[PDB]
Ligand binder design. Structure first.
Ligand SMILES: *[C@@H]1O[C@H](CO)[C@@H](O[C@@H]2O[C@H](CO)[C@@H](O[C@@H]3O[C@H](CO)[C@@H](O)[C@H](O[C@H]4O[C@H](CO)[C@@H](O)[C@H](O)[C@@H]4O)[C@@H]3O)[C@H](O)[C@H]2NC(C)=O)[C@H](O)[C@H]1NC(C)=O
Ligand SMILES: *[C@@H]1O[C@H](CO)[C@@H](O[C@@H]2O[C@H](CO)[C@@H](O[C@@H]3O[C@H](CO)[C@@H](O)[C@H](O)[C@@H]3O)[C@H](O)[C@H]2NC(C)=O)[C@H](O)[C@H]1NC(C)=O
Ligand SMILES: *[C@@H]1O[C@H](CO)[C@@H](O[C@@H]2O[C@H](CO)[C@@H](O[C@@H]3O[C@H](CO)[C@@H](O)[C@H](O)[C@@H]3O)[C@H](O)[C@H]2NC(C)=O)[C@H](O)[C@H]1NC(C)=O
Ligand SMILES: *[C@@H]1O[C@H](CO)[C@@H](O[C@@H]2O[C@H](CO)[C@@H](O)[C@H](O)[C@H]2NC(C)=O)[C@H](O)[C@H]1NC(C)=O
Ligand SMILES: *[C@@H]1O[C@H](CO)[C@@H](O[C@@H]2O[C@H](CO)[C@@H](O)[C@H](O)[C@H]2NC(C)=O)[C@H](O)[C@H]1NC(C)=O
Ligand SMILES: *[C@@H]1O[C@H](CO)[C@@H](O[C@@H]2O[C@H](CO)[C@@H](O)[C@H](O)[C@H]2NC(C)=O)[C@H](O)[C@H]1NC(C)=O
Ligand code: NAG
Ligand code: NAG
Ligand code: NAG
Ligand code: NAG
Ligand code: NAG
Ligand code: NAG
Ligand code: NAG
Lengths: 411, 137, 183, 49
């Protein structure tokens, strides 16, 4: 069963590569600005020395994951003027320079379906809780610039951009060599170059209306935000735990009770909050080891899938991948998948070889397909009647070593 | 209603007990400190970063001696520049771009040029363009 | 190392107990009183001890990421040849020489790097005597003198013969068909 | 000076308080034990480490 008529469609693949880096000052988390807590704190030991070595060790690794995914590019190539490459409409994917966004039309809809602690966003405000979320190294404009130079440069240079210097190539010359990857001839592109381009132009139009209407295709990026929210609020609500003291307030225990009633219940709420601080530090340290996994699925699907073309099955696109499109997104990467999906097969009769001159005749490629009328050589990805000649088949051994040889002639 | 609380559970707003003026209670400013040095073999000067703070209160409290910690021999040199990371104090703002050597955050890196410690915005890489030439390779 | 100096320096902590040496707690305090202050020192010395295990246990799984990298990047790159994108150096990997390092490995990947480029004018098809002709492997190359074939890594001319020409289909359909003489 | 310490807070060497000879201190022995056995099926002798 061999096809003749396929489809090209687009599949969205979504990954996160970084989560929100935080930091914690102990003396306002633990002590709550009291003096005698810090007097009690220095008797535990300098344990907040190590508990800002850890949340710096994570926060320095959310810079690498944002940088190891996107900053594979050596040269920031400009957005070209015409965005219409032999019928290929790259308008919605490269950013429109008319907007004051520096964002494509895809990326604007991605931010609008995703859309307690101190932060300086400019208005800088502090919280009573000692929780700060420092901003990343690469801002989202730099993230939307590496996106744009990965679709500008690959539209004009193709796999050469990942191979070496970004050598020019026409993009119709580009896609044809990407048919040569999947064992599919140049005539499949060039003969069909109108509706090849016009399915792909409407396949982008599907992803528009699929993302204007609904959401939850970005469920992974939502849950990265949700695990930020819980682990801060669990760290928030354990401030209000009594831990065997008469209250969870270090200044009531300071001021209202006796000084012998104080140090009994100061020493309770520190040891309670200290090892509730360490549980947070540990559970960030585990959750930042899944991101370091799923930022290496993105630093290989932006090495292998975006620059090259991948010879790996169900890896960056169901079916046979052709090209990949990076996007920016809040905390992560959204890929698009130009996939080769064959369709509309019919039944054909195969046979191992030809019996002519009493000798067996071995094909280099494919099978021998009986038309009902004629024998010929084709490949199993599209119907292609190439006739059995003197060099697309070779010889070893006599007939009937194969079971079911054809009484045919090598023409 | 006597007072207000935030989305957390500490009070940040109060109706005044004496004159009933509705107030806000933000906490005092605080944060971390970095130190940006180029190396002892390189030099003996440093420039410090004060994290997650407003340059209005930080540059004030240096001259008014309100910081814990406080240094023996230190002064700003009147170089205070607000990033989103905080008030970088001690380095010289430069309007050009380079490659990142010591990161700060929000697209700002710092290094050691002509020598002194300078700060700037990152350059993402070399700038270039490729023609889309319809028949050329 | 700094995991252990975390651990050694937590011997000298008092942990909220009376002292940080057990022969100074047992000395001054009497054995009904001392053994409750020893318990806050033992529990203080266990909770820094079990945390050391968990910090070793997470950093142990940080290495099984990098040890299953090096098991692949030796048994796919030295023991074969890698056909992947910037796996094993930058370019086109040819050999790889692994060395041995303290607590790790050292690779020596040798890549093939293209160089010294030059434009020309291209073509996807030739109209030769009523048909359109196509490349088997390569592109139609015109350096101003003649039309020939080369490969995309090295510039070397190939006479456009129907040996290395994908002969199929009629002329004047495909975009960019250039009237030449295929031999 | 009368006694030396190591990088920890343990006094690893002292001087003789009577004859002024400086003496190391060594933690006489400790260590773990492991049991190297062929399995209780094929044998019943072991070897300790
Ligand atoms: C760091 O702290 C300083 C001071 O603590 C702070 O600077 C202040 O910024 C605000 C605005 O953010 C300024 O307030 C404005 O002042 C002008 C002139 O006096 C007014 O015209 C403004 O009114 C406009 O804005 C109002 C609110 O947006 C509107 O309701 C109104 O209709 C007007 O459009 C406004 O009052 C203030 O003057 C400065 N003060 C000083 C001393 O600089 C700075 O923003 C802080 N930075 C961070 C990052 O926190
Ligand atoms: C092989 O697959 C392709 C696409 O999957 C099929 O092409 C489709 O052909 C139909 C005609 O039967 C097209 O409908 C017509 O489109 C034109 C557009 O100009 C319109 O003017 C007509 O009124 C009519 O609607 C259809 O558009 C086209 N598909 C696409 C995506 O353009 C083809 O028919 C398949 N072949 C077989 C044998 O099934
Ligand atoms: C390539 O794709 C882009 C999509 O980004 C196509 O642009 C779209 O073109 C249509 C036709 O003009 C626009 O519809 C019209 O928009 C105007 C603008 O206000 C409106 O007044 C009309 O009533 C009508 O709706 C459409 O908006 C536009 N899309 C965007 C996002 O701007 C472009 O036409 C495609 N290229 C080719 C050659 O078709
Ligand atoms: C290809 O062959 C299969 C089986 O050889 C065909 O499937 C059968 O179709 C008939 C109707 O013509 C049904 O009665 C059978 O139940 C089907 N069998 C199975 C296993 O599906 C199929 O229709 C053929 N398709 C083409 C395009 O020739
Ligand atoms: C373009 O390539 C062709 C080969 O494909 C070069 O042609 C040969 O050039 C040498 C040296 O000038 C001559 O001796 C041969 O007779 C030429 N052969 C043919 C078939 O023309 C040509 O020189 C190249 N163009 C340039 C400018 O170097
Ligand atoms: C390349 O050769 C083809 C051969 O078909 C040319 O097509 C001819 O075009 C002229 C006018 O341009 C017509 O008068 C002929 O009738 C066409 N040929 C046939 C067989 O109908 C084509 O024009 C040539 N390319 C260029 C650029 O001139
Ligand atoms: C194959 O069969 C179809 C219909 O049976 C016919 O139109 C076509 O010409 C045949 N091709 C060959 C090469 O025999
Ligand atoms: C093909 O020819 C050989 C030789 O005459 C014969 O043995 C064989 O049966 C033939 N094939 C079929 C399918 O009849
Ligand atoms: C200091 O840096 C210079 C730079 O070349 C180097 O030669 C020198 O060896 C360094 N100093 C020491 C003590 O290594
Ligand atoms: C590219 O070439 C094709 C055919 O030669 C032509 O139809 C198209 O207009 C050209 N485009 C540009 C931008 O030159
Ligand atoms: C190749 O062509 C481009 C534009 O067509 C030009 O800028 C460049 O200098 C050319 N390079 C060579 C080596 O011919
Ligand atoms: C104590 O006296 C003895 C001799 O009686 C002498 O050898 C030794 O050095 C003395 N030690 C001190 C500490 O005076
Ligand atoms: C026990 O040992 C005997 C030989 O000593 C061997 O054949 C047998 O398989 C062993 N069984 C188990 C459960 O170890």
């Amino acid at each position: 069963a061999i096809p003749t008529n396929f489809s090209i469609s687009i599949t969205t693949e979504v990954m996160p590569v970084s989560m929100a880096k935080t930091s914690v000052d102990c003396n306002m988390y633990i002590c709550g600005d009291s003096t005698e807590c810090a007097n009690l704190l220095l008797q535990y030991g300098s344990f907040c020395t190590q508990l800002n070595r850890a949340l710096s060790g994570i926060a320095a690794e959310q810079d690498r994951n944002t940088r190891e995914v996107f900053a594979q590019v050596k040269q920031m190539y400009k957005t070209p003027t015409l965005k219409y490459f032999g019928g290929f409409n790259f308008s919605q994917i490269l950013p429109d320079p008319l907007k004051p966004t520096k964002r494509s039309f895809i990326e604007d809809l991605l931010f609008n379906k995703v859309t307690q602690y101190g932060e300086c966003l400019l208005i800088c405000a502090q919280k009573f809780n000692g929780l700060t979320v420092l901003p990343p190294l690469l801002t989202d404009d730099m993230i939307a610039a590496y996106t744009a130079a990965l679709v500008s440069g690959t539209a004009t240079a193709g796999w050469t951009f990942g191979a070496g210097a970004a050598l020019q190539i026409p993009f119709a010359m580009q896609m044809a060599y990407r048919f040569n990857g999947i064992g599919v001839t140049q005539n499949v592109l060039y003969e069909n170059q109108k509706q090849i381009a016009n399915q792909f132009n409407k396949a982008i139009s599907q992803i528009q209306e699929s993302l204007t209407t609904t959401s939850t295709a970005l469920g992974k990026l939502q849950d990265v935000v949700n695990q930020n929210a819980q682990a801060l609020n669990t760290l928030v609500k354990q401030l209000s735990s009594n831990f065997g003291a008469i209250s969870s307030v270090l200044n009531d225990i300071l001021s209202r009770l006796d000084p012998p009633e104080a140090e009994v219940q100061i020493d309770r709420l520190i040891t309670g909050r200290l090892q509730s601080l360490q549980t947070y530090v540990t559970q960030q340290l585990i959750r930042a080891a899944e991101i370091r996994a799923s930022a290496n699925l993105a630093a290989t699907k932006m090495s292998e899938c975006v620059l090259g073309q991948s010879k790996r099955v169900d890896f960056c696109g169901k079916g046979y991948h052709l090209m990949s499109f990076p996007q920016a997104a809040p905390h992560g990467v959204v890929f698009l998948h130009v996939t080769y999906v064959p369709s509309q097969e019919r039944n054909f009769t195969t046979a191992p070889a030809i019996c002519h001159e009493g000798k067996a005749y071995f094909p280099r490629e494919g099978v021998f397909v009986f038309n009902g009328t004629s024998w010929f050589i084709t490949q199993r990805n599209f119907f292609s009647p190439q006739i059995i000649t003197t060099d697309n088949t070779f010889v070893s051994g006599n007939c009937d070593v194969v079971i079911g040889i054809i009484n045919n002639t090598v023409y | 209603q006597q007072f207000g609380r935030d989305v957390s559970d500490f009070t940040d707003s109060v109706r005044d007990p004496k004159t009933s003026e509705i107030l806000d209670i933000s906490p005092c400013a605080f944060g971390g400190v970095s130190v940006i040095t180029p190396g002892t073999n390189a030099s003996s000067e440093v420039a410090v970063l004060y994290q997650d703070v407003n340059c209005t209160d930080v540059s004030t409290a240096i001259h008014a001696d309100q910081l814990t910690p406080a240094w023996r021999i230190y002064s700003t040199g009147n170089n205070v520049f607000q990033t989103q990371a905080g008030c970088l104090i001690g380095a010289e703002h430069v309007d050009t771009s380079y490659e990142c050597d010591i990161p700060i955050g929000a697209g700002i890196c710092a290094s050691y040029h002509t020598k002194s410690i300078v700060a700037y915005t990152m350059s993402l890489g070399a700038d270039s363009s490729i023609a889309y030439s319809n028949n050329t390779i």
